[PDB]
Design an enzyme around this catalytic site. Structure first.
Site, PDB file in Angstrom:
ATOM      1  N   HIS A   1     -11.712   1.897 -16.532  1.00  0.00           N
ATOM      2  CA  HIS A   1     -12.568   0.722 -16.383  1.00  0.00           C
ATOM      3  C   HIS A   1     -13.190   0.572 -14.997  1.00  0.00           C
ATOM      4  CE1 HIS A   1     -12.938  -3.948 -16.930  1.00  0.00           C
ATOM      5  NE2 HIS A   1     -14.101  -3.328 -17.034  1.00  0.00           N
TER       6      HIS A   1
ATOM      7  N   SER B   1     -14.718  -3.000 -21.618  1.00  0.00           N
ATOM      8  CA  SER B   1     -14.109  -4.095 -20.869  1.00  0.00           C
ATOM      9  C   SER B   1     -13.582  -5.209 -21.773  1.00  0.00           C
ATOM     10  CB  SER B   1     -15.120  -4.676 -19.877  1.00  0.00           C
ATOM     11  OG  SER B   1     -16.268  -5.163 -20.547  1.00  0.00           O
TER      12      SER B   1
ATOM     13  N   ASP C   1       0.835  -1.192   0.000  1.00  0.00           N
ATOM     14  CA  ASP C   1       0.000   0.000   0.000  1.00  0.00           C
ATOM     15  C   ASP C   1       0.874   1.247   0.000  1.00  0.00           C
ATOM     16  OD1 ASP C   1      -2.571   1.377   2.247  1.00  0.00           O
ATOM     17  OD2 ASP C   1      -2.014   1.837   0.175  1.00  0.00           O
TER      18      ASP C   1
ATOM     19  N   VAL D   1     -20.803   3.837 -23.667  1.00  0.00           N
ATOM     20  CA  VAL D   1     -21.568   3.321 -24.796  1.00  0.00           C
ATOM     21  C   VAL D   1     -21.399   1.807 -24.914  1.00  0.00           C
ATOM     22  CG1 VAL D   1     -22.010   3.539 -27.264  1.00  0.00           C
ATOM     23  CG2 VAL D   1     -21.158   5.507 -25.956  1.00  0.00           C
ATOM     24  N   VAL D   2     -22.357   1.160 -25.570  1.00  0.00           N
ATOM     25  CA  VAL D   2     -22.334  -0.286 -25.748  1.00  0.00           C
ATOM     26  C   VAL D   2     -21.022  -0.748 -26.378  1.00  0.00           C
ATOM     27  CG1 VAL D   2     -23.698  -2.258 -26.518  1.00  0.00           C
ATOM     28  CG2 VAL D   2     -24.776   0.006 -26.285  1.00  0.00           C
ATOM     29  N   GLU D   3     -20.669  -2.005 -26.130  1.00  0.00           N
ATOM     30  CA  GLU D   3     -19.445  -2.578 -26.671  1.00  0.00           C
ATOM     31  C   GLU D   3     -19.499  -2.702 -28.189  1.00  0.00           C
ATOM     32  OE1 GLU D   3     -16.392  -3.960 -24.666  1.00  0.00           O
ATOM     33  OE2 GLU D   3     -17.311  -2.077 -24.023  1.00  0.00           O
TER      34      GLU D   3
ATOM     35  N   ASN E   1     -19.097  -3.387 -11.987  1.00  0.00           N
ATOM     36  CA  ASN E   1     -20.504  -3.449 -11.619  1.00  0.00           C
ATOM     37  C   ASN E   1     -20.697  -4.118 -10.261  1.00  0.00           C
ATOM     38  OD1 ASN E   1     -23.280  -4.636 -11.441  1.00  0.00           O
ATOM     39  ND2 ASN E   1     -23.492  -3.687 -13.463  1.00  0.00           N
TER      40      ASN E   1
ATOM     41  N   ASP F   1     -26.899  11.409 -23.495  1.00  0.00           N
ATOM     42  CA  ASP F   1     -27.571  10.237 -24.043  1.00  0.00           C
ATOM     43  C   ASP F   1     -28.326  10.651 -25.301  1.00  0.00           C
ATOM     44  OD1 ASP F   1     -29.532   7.985 -24.386  1.00  0.00           O
ATOM     45  OD2 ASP F   1     -28.654   7.338 -22.486  1.00  0.00           O
TER      46      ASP F   1
ATOM     47  N   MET G   1     -24.007   1.284 -15.879  1.00  0.00           N
ATOM     48  CA  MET G   1     -22.682   1.857 -15.649  1.00  0.00           C
ATOM     49  C   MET G   1     -22.670   3.380 -15.732  1.00  0.00           C
ATOM     50  SD  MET G   1     -21.114  -0.832 -14.952  1.00  0.00           S
ATOM     51  CE  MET G   1     -19.330  -0.817 -15.034  1.00  0.00           C
TER      52      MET G   1
END
Ligand SMILES: NC(=O)c1ccc[n+]([C@@H]2O[C@H](COP(=O)([O-])OP(=O)(O)OC[C@H]3O[C@@H](n4cnc5c(N)ncnc54)[C@H](O)[C@@H]3O)[C@@H](O)[C@H]2O)c1
Ligand SMILES: NC(=O)c1ccc[n+]([C@@H]2O[C@H](COP(=O)([O-])OP(=O)(O)OC[C@H]3O[C@@H](n4cnc5c(N)ncnc54)[C@H](O)[C@@H]3O)[C@@H](O)[C@H]2O)c1
Lengths: 708, 238
Positions: free
Chosen positions: B212, B191, B58, B162-164, B215, B105, B86
């Site tokens: 990244h 991801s 740490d 946004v979507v993958e 969830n 959006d 997300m």
């Protein structure tokens, strides 16, 4: 079958049990009109003879259970002599009484709304089953009267004195949950299961499981309370109501005084007290006035259906401003379910907007009146912005920019380029012409006027100004969007002062004259607040602000020179030239450190005191009311407010006209259109603001009235 | 109690009890003898030096962290391109800590889901006695919904949720770089897609990196800072 009418059907069932359903064929709802009372009369006498009867289940065929009788029949009934009216209820209660003395278990199946006489009907029965999606209440006081069908007799003995006083003095509707808690209902069940609920209950009464003879007894005898306990139970109730209602509305207190008298009597003598008071309240010069508002309401609803045929729902609102009015309009819009944008040129502006818009919601959450989950939803609808990038799908925009024709034209014009072409624009200005601010747009048809008041979340009225280039769809859309925000919109043609302001100043003119006439303003507003007004003229000038009442004066002067021009110096000027600007400045007629009389004003109002004429109270009332009323008359003759009903309701919501008086125009009717004219001549020596019109004089001869 | 919420793998938690349990009838002197005796026993256990190693690592981390803070910029105005799962979470965490984050959006329904779950969280605690409504307001005021890039004029960092889809992400990020400033930093939350690939669309890949989140965004600690071949030290540090 056993019986069959046009509103009531008594069909037999199993185990001797018979159902008495209220289904008024032809109409949408059920109500105790002249017919129903007669059919129920026969129905009872029918069950009173049929020996095969083993129980009675009262149901409803329509959606609602039983609502109050037609408002039209009320007025017709409240004109008859006291002796004839009492006989009408004395025989009416007898009907319900017979159903109560019926030697057989009776249960009411409240499937839907049961108001006024509806609830009183159920009260007559022994048991009561209610659908969780239903509501019950006695909104009698909303007309200046109290339950006349045994309501003030059976409820107090069924749910207790206190709880009864509340249910009656408020006239509020009651949900299923609360209805059971006070025992107004014996059981709550789902809509579908409400049927068997009654049947199963009946059998459990016939067998003897549920002693119905004992459950019926309470409302057939004296109250269970102690003499001492009664003393408090009522006196405190009286003191409470009188302090939150006002000496202007008898009904609220009369109901208590009624229950207080019959506090030691049976049902019979209690009913005699109920009817006795019912007749007394039915004649008050307040009852029929409130009833008048109910009429004006219905007129507004019918006309409302007109606009609702060409008005596009505003699923995406947007306001150009924040802080005071901008933030409020953004609040109300969101608080009702309408995503509203908040455009501003500087970040500090949006700050103030969201600031006050937050102190409102949180202000209730920190008191237990709103769920945080809801506060979030409301705060999510409001979407702050500094650019017109999100105005892509706005259905209506409201301008809250400062009072400046030059500016408003540059702003509105700039917005019309970003918004759609079918999108409707609107102005919230209070002292600027719409027809003038409309000559800047390239599509004035979609432009109108939406005038909110301060505070936006407190004031009901929302004038819908119509410019010369305004279209019907534009106006209709504004009305619907206003009504959707829980408001009371009333279309008004563009003119200096519109409706409220155009009547407010002529009213203030009488005040200015009084002050100049050496009349103590502290006394003036003491007679006005006693007259019924929430705040007196003087104390009102502070709430609005002298600096505000001054600019508004000049606007009405250049607008109606023929009767609203003034060349002398009024108290309004003495203050504007003395740095006194109202409640915001802390200095006006009173001192605002919360309302004290400071003598440091006498030295300022001296230059205004001209003559030193004597004056009583009745005069003050006319020196103020005559101008206001007459002006309202002009706002109808000249062609501003489409009707008389809308004219009065416009003041009832905007200026806060005494409810027990009906309104400005109706006030003239109360005194008499003809008699009012004479009242105008006696004080006609005060200017054109006290001179009736050629039309007002004419209708005074024919005997006609504004609400004849 | 401890044995059932800690596990037979961590001796310390239980040994502390056994220690106090033995000295339960002794004075200070004998109690200390029981304390030190157990202290030595735990100092030799395998779980000890490992946990010690965690903290040992740490320190090294915080030291490296200080290296970043020497060139990192404080995002006083964040913005995320998305909502719902997300997107809404990223918009929540940013606001819950004090960072006005935008929520862009293409459709109104999207911004709905975003604010929806972002509300169920705050209210989820106020309806239990853990957060003042006054604070819930501040958080909900930091989040500013939008359907256009008109408010991205002062964003210091943007996160794409946004979507993958490489094709889509390239069109989106590219469109954003035209509205945002040139010194502004962009970031992807993908991801299963290469950052070096999504970077060949931008005209200034230097200001592009990878952020990244996991969830749920408000529960998981780790936040990988992916570095593309064209990524800069300042971009990563930020
Ligand atoms: N006395 C009252 O409180 C009262 C009563 C009735 C009606 N009104 C009406 O309210 C309006 C005044 O609004 P206010 O009280 O918020 O004034 P204000 O001075 O309190 O606030 C003005 C706000 O408007 C913003 N603004 C100015 N120009 C703008 C533009 N072009 N685009 C977007 N935002 C802009 C400013 O940034 C600021 O936030 C007037 O039309 C007035 O007639 C006021
Ligand atoms: N399974 C998971 O929950 C999970 C786990 C780890 C990482 N992620 C990452 O999260 C991202 C996906 O986010 P999600 O889970 O919310 O997906 P989602 O389908 O739940 O929501 C997609 C949102 O993006 C919006 N959107 C799409 N295209 C847009 C555009 N061009 N401009 C603006 N908004 C646009 C949509 O309107 C919608 O609100 C991916 O990068 C994925 O790798 C997801």
């Amino acid at each position: 079958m056993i019986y069959e009418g046009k509103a009531i059907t008594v069909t037999a069932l199993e185990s001797g049990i018979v159902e008495l359903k209220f289904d008024l064929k032809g109409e949408s709802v059920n109500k105790f009109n002249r017919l129903t009372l007669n059919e129920l009369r026969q129905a009872v006498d029918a069950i009173k003879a049929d020996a095969s009867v083993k129980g009675v289940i009262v149901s409803s065929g329509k959606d609602v259970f039983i609502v109050g009788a037609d408002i039209t029949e009320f007025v017709e009934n409240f004109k008859l002599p006291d002796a004839e009216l009492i006989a009408g209820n004395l025989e009416a209660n007898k009907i319900f009484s017979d159903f109560e003395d019926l030697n057989v278990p009776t249960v009411a199946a409240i499937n839907g709304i049961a108001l006024g006489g509806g609830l009183e009907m159920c009260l007559a029965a022994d048991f009561r089953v209610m659908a969780d999606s239903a509501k019950i209440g006695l909104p009698e006081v909303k007309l200046g009267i109290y339950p006349g069908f045994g309501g003030t007799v059976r409820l107090p003995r069924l749910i207790g004195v206190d709880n009864a006083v509340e249910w009656i003095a408020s006239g509020k509707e009651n949900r299923a949950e609360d209805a059971l808690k006070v025992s107004a209902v014996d059981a709550v069940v789902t809509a579908d299961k409400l049927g068997a609920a009654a049947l199963d209950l009946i059998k459990r009464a016939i067998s003897g499981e549920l002693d119905y003879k004992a459950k019926r007894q309470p409302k057939l005898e004296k109250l269970k309370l102690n003499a001492i306990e009664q003393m408090m139970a009522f006196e405190t109730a009286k003191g409470f109501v009188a302090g939150q209602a006002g000496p202007n509305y008898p009904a609220p207190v009369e109901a208590i005084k009624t229950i207080q008298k019959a506090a030691n009597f049976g049902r019979d003598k209690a009913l005699e007290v109920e009817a006795a008071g019912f007749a007394k309240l039915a004649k008050t010069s307040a009852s029929n006035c409130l009833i008048g508002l109910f009429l004006n309401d219905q007129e507004l609803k019918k006309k409302a259906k007109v606009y609702d045929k060409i008005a596009k729902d505003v699923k995406q609102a947007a306001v150009l401003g924040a802080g005071i009015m901008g933030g409020g309009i953004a609040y109300q819009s969101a608080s009702k379910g309408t995503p509203i944008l908040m455009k501003d040129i500087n970040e500090h502006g949006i700050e103030q907007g969201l600031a006050e818009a937050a102190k409102l919601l949180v202000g209730r959450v920190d008191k237990g009146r709103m769920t945080p989950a809801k506060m979030a939803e409301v705060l999510n609808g409001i979407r702050p912005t500094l650019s017109y990038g999100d105005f892509g799908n706005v259905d209506l925009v409201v301008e809250a920019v400062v009072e400046n024709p030059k500016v408003k034209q540059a702003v509105l014009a700039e917005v019309e380029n970003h918004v759609r072409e079918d999108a409707i624009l609107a102005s919230n200005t209070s002292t600027i012409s719409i027809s003038l601010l409309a000559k800047a747009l390239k599509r004035p048809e979609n432009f109108v006027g939406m005038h909110f008041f301060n505070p936006v979340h407190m004031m009901p009225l929302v004038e819908v100004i119509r410019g010369e280039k305004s279209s019907d769809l534009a106006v209709a859309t504004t009305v619907a969007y206003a009504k959707k925000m829980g408001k009371n919109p009333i279309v008004v043609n563009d003119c200096p002062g519109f409706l409220v302001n155009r009547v407010l100043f002529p009213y203030f003119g009488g005040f200015a004259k009084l002050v100049s006439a050496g009349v103590d303003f502290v006394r003036i507003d003491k007679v006005m607040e006693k007259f019924g007004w929430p705040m007196g003229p003087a104390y009102l000038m502070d709430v609005v602000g002298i600096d505000t009442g001054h600019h508004g004066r000049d606007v009405m002067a250049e607008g109606f020179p023929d009767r609203m021009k003034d060349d002398r110096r009024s108290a309004i000027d003495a203050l504007y030239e003395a740095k006194r600007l109202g409640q915001k400045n802390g200095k006006g007629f009173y001192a605002y450190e919360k309302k004290l009389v400071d003598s440091s004003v006498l030295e300022v109002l001296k230059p205004i005191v001209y003559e030193q004429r004597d004056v009583t109270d009745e005069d003050i009332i006319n020196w103020m009311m005559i101008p206001l009323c007459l002006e309202t008359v002009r706002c109808l003759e000249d062609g501003i407010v489409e009707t008389a009903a809308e004219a009065d309701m416009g003041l009832v919501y905007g200026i806060g006209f005494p409810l027990f008086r009906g309104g400005a125009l109706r006030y003239i009717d109360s005194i008499g259109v003809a008699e009012f004219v004479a009242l105008a001549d006696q004080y006609a020596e005060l200017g054109a603001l006290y001179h009736p019109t050629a039309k007002l004089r004419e209708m005074a001869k024919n005997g006609q009235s504004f609400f004849g």
